[PDB]
Paper text:
However, while 45LNIYQY50 (R1), 47IYQYGG52 (R1), and 137VTQVGF142 (R5) formed unbranched and elongated amyloid-like fibrils, the 129TASNSS134 (R4-R5 loop) segment formed scarce and more amorphous structures. The 129TASNSS134 segment from the R4-R5 loop did not bind ThT. Unlike the three spine segments that adopted tightly packed steric zipper architectures, 129TASNSS134 adopted an anti-parallel β-sheet structure lacking a dry interface between mated sheets. The packing of the β-sheets most closely resembled a class 8 steric zipper, with a truncated interface between the two facing β-sheets. In contrast, 129TASNSS134 does not contain any residues that have been shown to act as sequence determinants of CsgA fibrillation, and moreover, Ser133 is nonessential for fibrillation. Furthermore, in agreement with its atypical crystal structure, 129TASNSS134 formed scarce and more amorphous structures, and did not bind ThT. The R1 segment 47IYQYGG52 and the control segment 129TASNSS134 showed a milder effect on the fibrillation rate of Aβ1–40.
CsgA, a 151-residue protein, consists of five imperfect sequence repeats (R1-R5), defined by regularly spaced serine (Ser), glutamine (Gln) and asparagine (Asn) residues. The first and the last repeats (R1 and R5) form amyloid fibrils in isolation and are critical to CsgA seeding and nucleation by CsgB, while the other repeats (R2-R4) contain 'gatekeeper' residues that temper the amyloidogenicity of CsgA.
Author numbering: 1 to 6
Amino acid sequence: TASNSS
């Protein structure tokens, strides 16, 4: 899976 935040 993949995730990010900013």
